[PDB]
Amino acid sequence: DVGSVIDASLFDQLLKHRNDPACEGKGFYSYNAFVTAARSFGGFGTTGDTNTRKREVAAFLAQTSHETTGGAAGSPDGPYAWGYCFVTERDKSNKYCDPGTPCPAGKSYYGRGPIQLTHNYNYAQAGRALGVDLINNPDLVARDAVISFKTAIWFWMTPQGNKPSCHDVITNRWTPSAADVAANRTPGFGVITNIINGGIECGRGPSPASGDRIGFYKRYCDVLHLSYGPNLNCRDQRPFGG
């Protein structure tokens, strides 16, 4: 059980401003919803020694905190105490319907949830894996908290083509290929950022978005009493297309 790694108090300590009236959630991102969703995925937060399990939870929460951050320089308790502030993308004018997948009348596929799931084809994939109709009910990702967390954890646990799962990277189960070694994709937090949004954030030098993900990771590691580990950035990694 992932609940043995992170209890309700730690969860609240890490995500201390999620329920702020200045945040969108207003009680959406609950600990109960998190642990309920986590139980659906064997291996999540229960793989390896205790520190690896804690590290998986810290890395997952760091990446997702960045995707939903309401933090800034000067925010109370700093920028890294404002994860999980938002549920939906601010701009809701873009439907994000790609031509090959259905796009039902009156449905939009803008970012929703911890991993800010976007595009009709991604909703279709997540939907099929979770056994829920997300193409016709994309709003569930912003209304059903258990499904919301499930979409994020599903993404975290899922390998795709040349990309390993974030889960395998953080638990040292991923063995980079010669192509990865050549692209400087060394196992660590940076590779996870690369899997999530490397096309924009990696291989072009410093990225403030990448720096925000790292800031959350460091704070979470400090609270969970974990050392940071190597390869936190991806400044020199070629985005997944190696």
Identify the helix (H) or strand (E) that includes residue 169. helix 166-170
Rg of the chain over CA atoms, in angstroms?
A: 17
Q: List, in order of start, the domains of the chain with CATH numbers.
A: 1-87+144-241 (1.10.530.10), 88-143 (3.30.20.10)
Q: How far apart are CA 144 and CA 61, in angstroms?
A: 19
In angstroms, what CA-CA distances link 56 with 3, 116, 143? 13, 19, 26
Q: What is the DSSP string of 116-165?
A: TB-SHHHHHHHHHHHTS-TTT-TTHHHH-HHHHHHHHHHHHH--BTTBPP
Biggest CA-to-CA distance, the chain: 49
| Resolution given for this structure, in angstroms | 1.8
Instruction: Out of 56, 67, 89, 201, pick the active-site residue.
Output: 67
Specify the length of the chain in residues: 242
| Residue pointed to by tokens 């105490």 | 81
Residues 6+ apart with CB under 8 A from 122: 109
Intra-chain end-to-end CA distance of the chain, in Å:
36
Active site residue 24: no
